[PDB]
UniProtKB/Swiss-Prot annotation, chain B:
Pfam families membership: NDUF_B4 (PF07225)
Membrane topology: Single-pass membrane protein
Protein name per the record: NADH dehydrogenase [ubiquinone] 1 beta subcomplex subunit 4
Modification type Phosphoserine: residues: 15
Family: Belongs to the complex I NDUFB4 subunit family.
InterPro entries: NADH_UbQ_OxRdtase_NDUFB4_su
Swiss-Prot record, chain D:
SS bonds (residue pairs): none
Family the UniProt entry places it in: Belongs to the complex I NDUFB10 subunit family.
Quaternary structure (record): Complex I is composed of 45 different subunits. Interacts with CHCHD4.
Organism phylogeny: Eukaryota, Metazoa, Chordata, Craniata, Vertebrata
Domain of life of the native organism: Eukaryota
Protein name: NADH dehydrogenase [ubiquinone] 1 beta subcomplex subunit 10
Job of this protein: Accessory subunit that is involved in the functional assembly of the mitochondrial respiratory chain complex I. Complex I has an NADH dehydrogenase activity with ubiquinone as an immediate electron acceptor and mediates the transfer of electrons from NADH to the respiratory chain.
Subcellular location: Mitochondrion inner membrane
From Swiss-Prot, chain F:
The protein's name in its UniProt record: Acyl carrier protein, mitochondrial
Shown stretch of the complete protein: 72 to 156 of 156
Annotated localization: Mitochondrion
Function summary: Carrier of the growing fatty acid chain in fatty acid biosynthesis. Accessory and non-catalytic subunit of the mitochondrial membrane respiratory chain NADH dehydrogenase (Complex I), which functions in the transfer of electrons from NADH to the respiratory chain. Accessory protein, of the core iron-sulfur cluster (ISC) assembly complex, that regulates, in association with LYRM4, the stability and the cysteine desulfurase activity of NFS1 and participates in the [2Fe-2S] clusters assembly on the scaffolding protein ISCU.
Organism of origin: Bos taurus (Bovine)
Record text on subunit structure and interactions: Mammalian complex I is composed of 45 different subunits. Interacts with ETFRF1. Identified in a complex composed of MALSU1, MIEF1 upstream open reading frame protein and NDUFAB1; within the trimeric complex MIEF1 upstream open reading frame protein functions as a bridging scaffold that interacts with MALSU1 on one side, and with NDUFAB1 on the other side. The complex interacts with the mitochondrial large ribosomal subunit. Interacts with alpha-1-microglobulin chain; this interaction is required for the maintenance of mitochondrial redox homeostasis.
Modified positions (O-(pantetheine 4'-phosphoryl)serine) in chain numbering: 41
From Swiss-Prot, chain H:
Compartments in which it is found: Mitochondrion inner membrane; Mitochondrion intermembrane space
Residue span, CHCH domain: 1-41
Organism: Bos taurus (Bovine)
Domain comment as written in the entry: Contains two C-X9-C motifs that are predicted to form a helix-coil-helix structure, permitting the formation of intramolecular disulfide bonds.
Top-level taxonomy: Eukaryota, Metazoa, Chordata, Craniata, Vertebrata
Top-level lineage group: Eukaryota
Full-protein positions shown: 58 to 115 of 137
Recorded family membership: Belongs to the complex I NDUFB7 subunit family.
Record motif Cx9C motif 1, residues: 2-12
Protein's name in the database: NADH dehydrogenase [ubiquinone] 1 beta subcomplex subunit 7
Quaternary structure annotation from Swiss-Prot or TrEMBL: Complex I is composed of 45 different subunits.
Record-annotated disulphide pairs: 2-33, 12-23
Gene: NDUFB7
Length: 55, 118, 55, 169, 166, 85, 457, 58
């Protein structure tokens, strides 16, 4: 069984890696928002979303 | 539709009289195969062969309309209930919708303000 | 004014291989590379009017 | 021009107060692409305008007015009704496109305000309700396919219903 | 064909075991457990009990029957490239090549003329050889191999001896 | 990847020798698994499953009865995969 | 200007030598089709008048152009067929197609109800001879007998209807004269007056009942898949429904209400049967019932939107279904049996034809706006103003229109063709020409079909 | 609802500044009044709960 590295595969995915790591830092930061509800319930709603993925 | 488990290793006779009948299946199969084999491997053929099994298959659906159905039984009347039935079904659907609409135009206006269409 | 002019270019660039598909110019093996090069410059001509929108 | 409503005045002026970086990249490209192919296309349009020189006049739309209405012409006659049927059909083709102009006025109302849209305007939505309601009750919209004789019956049906309501109240 | 019924059930049991297990070392452990089941009962001759065990073998096989079976490579039917990456141009299309275009690669055209000449000349001998081997009326299920193969050419080859590949 | 006639004789022999059911001196190339090598009825299906998984698993039950000799099994695997021109 | 060039096409075939024939019949019809597109497209405020009533004018007829477009297209398809037959019979046959097109020019141009009807029935006799002779299949006589049994029993009631109306109110003749129209008061004597005018165009415009007229004419085809385009012209030949409903009876349309309902099941149940059937021509024949049922639903509503959709659909079906019959012709000329299961496999033998299969099948569905979407979408939007529940019935039809096209594709996409030794040669120059001359006018009508869907548009 | 602090964030966005990320002071001021507005809605729910408790006792 052989799995070789291709010059076409590396240059395609590496440029997508910039797009996958730097998407929310550019797009959602520059786009105009309308009413943010992030204020109420830090231990019951805000932290629970990240903790569910950990659990 | 199959009712119990998927039928493949279930319900079979243990090498009884069915073995003589199963050997007869290959005898007729090869009889139709050998005449197919002789009319295939020649370079001077050029053309699609008949195969009478598929010719009679088309004849079973396209023809056999009036040679069949000469005893018009109660099952045909049950098929007629699925025939005329649905056509008379919508008569009490569209009219009830129309009499709902037409009465709303005359008394207690329900017409749209921006309706330039039709 | 340039926002309206450059917006249709993205629609035009993608249709150019379709318009030059039936014979047109003798290009074997280069045609799959022609699709890649057409979209690459279509990305640049789409990045500029989005910067106009954020502005 | 004239028939189109349009915006009153366009605002916007460059500020550039916060940060330096590389100024405005969009404005830098705006000056760059103005001479790149926007100036070349303007020069080509001027060259095509100069090459025109002599041009045909073309007397535009023909008039043809009145010629007696179908309501004035009493009793059925093929010689009299024919010109009346053409007059009603010409008006119906115009009245179709009158709605289309006010339809595009409402299209301009949506864009030229954007954020407000429903809260502002107030005139274009009111003008739309004044014309469409008049178009719905008088110019077919319920009388199926277009016919001049059917329109006179439709006008009489609306008049008889209005007279019965006015006399009672 | 009772011997075939045991083999087909055992072949299905091995290829269905890999779908349930995850690792290769666990696959070897359960296979030896299956070898402890079938080899112990096949040693003694049974007339009624052997068919009774085979009908009982339907159970356990049906209790664990569908976890989506691992038909990973190019297998007949099932899943994952059954009859795929196939242009498969037949020999019938290889005869209708247009002039001023068939001249390109002349070695393929010159060889195919010799193959067609070999088939046309041997067909009369193949019809006699194939027509000779007959039990009475119709064949008894099976192909006809060459008996008196002096020169060469079996009775019935072109599609069988001329596959497109893959 | 391309497959050769020498490759089919090398891959099948290495898979058969690694099975440990039969000795390397007992089975070479032409010694049949049915009588000469010394393999059971359950072993015939086990050797066929192991040889298929190593190269390209496309062995039907109908061809499993015909597959008894390793020289014939290497030829049947080459015929189905269309190997060696 | 359209009288005596088609009549001058008649001595052309007889006078020309045996080596030519086909070269003259096609070339001296393509330039005639050019003049139809040159002159007839002009319109004023309303309907014009080209001449005194021998052949009148156009009101909402770009459908005349379609017949002129099929004037050489039938001669294109019947090239492999009638190649081994007698040279005198070739001259006899082309004149019979010309005579069909001669009366078809007359029927669309003449704005009468009396002159129209007798030349509407003058298309029946040439088609009868074209079906009952050169028919490749047995029992073609049933396709001939029922052709005149279903049509004439419904159309002869027009003689007792049309003459009755002109005896009471002026004369039907000039049509633009006929605006002396009195509203029908809905009486029991007027019940059969409406029915007799409709039943004549309930046969050629196939409903659910009395629809067996169509598939028998297609299965027992006149010529392979070549003269079927004339039977497509007979489907759109029931355009008198556009004129009768508008002029003769506008008030009483309470009797139209059951006929829409009868054609509503002539949408679903006519598409259900067109799923299992073995004959490839019959899979076009039963699909042609449903697409022409759309018009019968539309016209009887009488809303201005339905007329826009109907007139588009008459032109849409005339170039899409006929194109599908040309694909059925190309398969039948090689295999010589129209079995769908037997003829299986494209791209392995026919690579270029497979793209033409797509541009003809997918047009049954609502593609990027060709004329079929423009035809269908206006009708569906017209049925909602009639009643809200219609789209539930119409939506099922939208699913089975995909079961028309893709099922025709999949049963030809399956690459096998093991038994087939024939179909060695891919396609002739005239064979691919039929695929182009049917689809490229549909592709040109994507841009601006203003001069297609035009009853006051 | 806030308007006064929210317009300042739009005023920061009114100026170009390529690759916009360094404007947090206007965003924090907009979030400060929004948290106060959320607290005012929470106090209104608390006052409604306090009024319901007094009504249940009497």
């Amino acid at each position: 069984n052989i799995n070789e590295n291709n010059p076409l595969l590396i240059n395609s995915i590496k440029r997508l890696l910039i797009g996958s790591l730097f998407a929310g830092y550019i797009i959602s930061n520059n786009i105009p928002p309308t009413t943010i509800p992030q204020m109420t319930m830090p231990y019951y709603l805000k932290t629970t979303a990240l903790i569910v993925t950990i659990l | 539709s199959s009712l119990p488990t998927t039928l493949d290793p279930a319900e079979y006779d243990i090498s009884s009289e069915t073995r003589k009948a199963q050997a007869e299946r290959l005898a007729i199969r090869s009889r139709l195969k050998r005449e197919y084999q002789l009319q295939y491997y020649d370079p001077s053929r050029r053309g699609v062969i008949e195969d009478p099994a598929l010719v009679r298959w088309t004849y079973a659906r396209s023809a056999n309309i009036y040679p069949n159905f000469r005893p018009n039984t109660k099952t045909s009347l049950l098929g007629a209930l699925f025939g005329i039935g649905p056509l008379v079904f919508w008569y009490y659907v569209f009219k009830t919708d129309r009499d709902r609409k037409e009465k709303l135009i005359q008394e207690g206006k329900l017409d749209r303000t921006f309706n330039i269409s039709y | 004014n340039m926002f309206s002019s450059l917006s249709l270019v993205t629609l035009l660039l993608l249709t150019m291989p379709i318009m030059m598909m039936s014979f047109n110019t003798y290009k074997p093996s280069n045609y799959p590379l022609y699709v890649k090069t057409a979209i690459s410059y279509a990305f640049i001509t789409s990045m500029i009017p989005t910067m106009m929108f954020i502005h | 021009x004239x028939x189109x409503x349009x915006x009153x005045x366009x605002x916007x002026x460059x500020x550039x107060x916060x940060x330096x970086x590389x100024x405005x990249x969009x404005x830098x490209x705006x000056x760059x692409x103005x001479x790149x192919x926007x100036x070349x296309x303007x020069x080509x349009x001027x060259x095509x305008x100069x090459x025109x020189x002599x041009x045909x006049x073309x007397x535009x739309x023909x008039x043809x007015x009145x010629x007696x209405x179908x309501x004035x012409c009493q009793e059925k006659d093929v010689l009299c009704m024919f010109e009346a049927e053409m007059q009603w059909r010409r008006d119906y083709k115009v009245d179709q496109e009158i709605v289309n102009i006010i339809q595009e006025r409402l299209k301009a109302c949506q864009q030229r305000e954007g954020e407000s849209h429903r809260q502002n305007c107030a005139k274009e939505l009111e003008q739309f309700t004044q014309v469409v309601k008049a178009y719905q009750d008088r110019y077919x919209x319920x009388x199926x396919x277009x016919x001049x004789x059917x329109x006179x019956x439709x006008x009489x049906x609306x008049x008889x219903x209005x007279x019965x309501x006015x006399x009672x109240x | 064909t009772h011997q075939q019924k045991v083999l087909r059930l055992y072949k299905r049991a091995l290829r269905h075991l890999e779908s349930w297990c995850i690792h290769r070392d666990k696959y070897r452990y359960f296979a030896c457990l299956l070898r402890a089941r079938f080899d112990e009962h096949k040693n003694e001759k049974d007339m009624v009990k052997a068919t009774q065990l085979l009908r009982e073998a339907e159970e356990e096989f049906w209790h664990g029957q569908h976890p989506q079976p691992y038909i990973f490579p190019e297998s007949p039917g099932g899943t994952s490239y059954e009859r795929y990456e196939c242009y498969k141009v037949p020999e019938w299309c290889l005869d209708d090549w247009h002039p001023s275009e068939k001249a390109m690669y002349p070695d393929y055209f010159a060889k195919r003329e010799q193959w067609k000449k070999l088939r046309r000349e041997s067909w009369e001998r193949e019809v006699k050889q194939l027509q000779e081997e007959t039990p009475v009326g119709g064949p008894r299920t099976e192909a006809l191999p060459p008996a008196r193969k002096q020169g060469d050419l079996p009775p019935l080859w072109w599609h069988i001896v001329t596959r497109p590949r893959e | 990847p391309p497959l050769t006639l020498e490759g089919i004789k090398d891959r099948v022999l290495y898979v058969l020798k690694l099975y440990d059911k039969i000795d390397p001196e007992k089975l070479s190339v032409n010694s049949h698994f049915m009588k000469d090598l010394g393999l059971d009825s359950l072993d015939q299906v086990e050797i066929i499953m192991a040889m298929e998984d190593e190269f390209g698993f496309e062995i039907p039950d109908i061809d499993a009865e015909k597959l008894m000799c390793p020289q014939e099994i290497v030829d049947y695997i080459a015929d189905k995969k269309d190997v060696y021109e | 200007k359209y009288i005596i060039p088609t009549i001058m096409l008649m001595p052309l075939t007889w006078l020309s030598k045996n080596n030519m024939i086909w070269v003259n019949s096609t070339a001296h019809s393509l330039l005639i089709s050019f003049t139809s597109l040159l002159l007839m497209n002009q319109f004023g405020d309303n309907s014009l008048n080209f001449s005194l009533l021998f052949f009148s004018d156009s009101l909402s007829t770009p459908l005349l152009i379609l017949t002129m477009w099929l004037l050489p297209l039938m001669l294109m398809a019947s090239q492999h067929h009638l190649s081994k037959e007698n040279l005198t019979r070739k001259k006899l046959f082309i004149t019979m197609l010309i005579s069909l097109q001669l009366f078809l020019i007359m029927t669309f141009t003449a704005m009468e109800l009396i002159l129209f009807y007798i030349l509407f029935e003058a298309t029946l006799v040439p088609t009868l001879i074209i079906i009952t002779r050169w028919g490749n299949q047995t029992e073609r006589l049933n396709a001939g007998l029922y052709f005149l049994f279903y049509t004439l029993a419904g159309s002869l009631p027009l003689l007792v209807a049309l003459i009755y109306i002109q005896n009471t109110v002026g004369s039907l003749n000039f049509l633009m004269l006929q605006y002396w129209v009195q509203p029908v008061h809905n009486s029991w004597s007027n019940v059969f007056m409406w029915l007799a005018c409709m039943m004549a165009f309930m046969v050629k415009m196939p409903l659910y009942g009395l629809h067996l007229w169509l598939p028998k004419a297609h299965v027992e085809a006149p010529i392979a898949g070549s003269m079927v385009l004339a039977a497509v012209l007979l489907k759109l030949g029931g355009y008198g429904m556009l004129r009768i409903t508008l002029i003769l009876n506008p008030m009483t349309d309470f009797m139209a209400y059951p006929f829409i309902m009868l054609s509503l099941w002539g949408m679903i149940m006519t598409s259900s049967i067109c799923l299992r059937q073995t004959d490839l021509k019959s899979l076009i024949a039963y699909s042609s019932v449903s697409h022409m049922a759309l018009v019968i639903v539309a016209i009887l509503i009488q809303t201005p939107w339905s007329y826009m959709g109907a007139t588009a659909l008459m032109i849409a079906h005339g170039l899409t279904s006929s194109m599908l019959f040309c694909l059925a012709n190309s398969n039948y000329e090689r295999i010589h049996s129209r079995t769908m299961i037997l003829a299986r496999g494209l791209q392995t033998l026919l690579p270029l034809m497979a793209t033409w299969w797509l541009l003809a099948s997918l047009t049954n569905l609502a593609l990027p706006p060709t004329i079929n979407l423009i035809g269908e979408l206006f009708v569906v939007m017209s049925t909602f103003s009639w009643s809200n529940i219609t789209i539930i019935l119409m939506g099922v039809n939208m699913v089975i229109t995909a079961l028309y096209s893709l099922y025709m594709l999949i049963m030809t996409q399956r690459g096998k063709y093991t038994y087939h030794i024939n179909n060695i040669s891919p396609s002739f120059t005239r064979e691919n020409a039929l695929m182009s001359l049917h689809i490229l006018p549909l592709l040109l009508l994507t841009l601006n079909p203003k001069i297609i869907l035009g009853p006051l548009y | 609802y806030c308007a006064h602090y929210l317009i300042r964030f739009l005023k920061c966005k009114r100026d170009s500044f390529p690759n916009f990320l360094a404007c947090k002071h206007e965003r924090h001021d907009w979030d400060y009044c929004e948290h106060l507005d959320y607290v005012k809605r929470m106090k209104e729910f608390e006052r409604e709960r306090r009024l319901l408790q007094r009504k249940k006792r009497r």
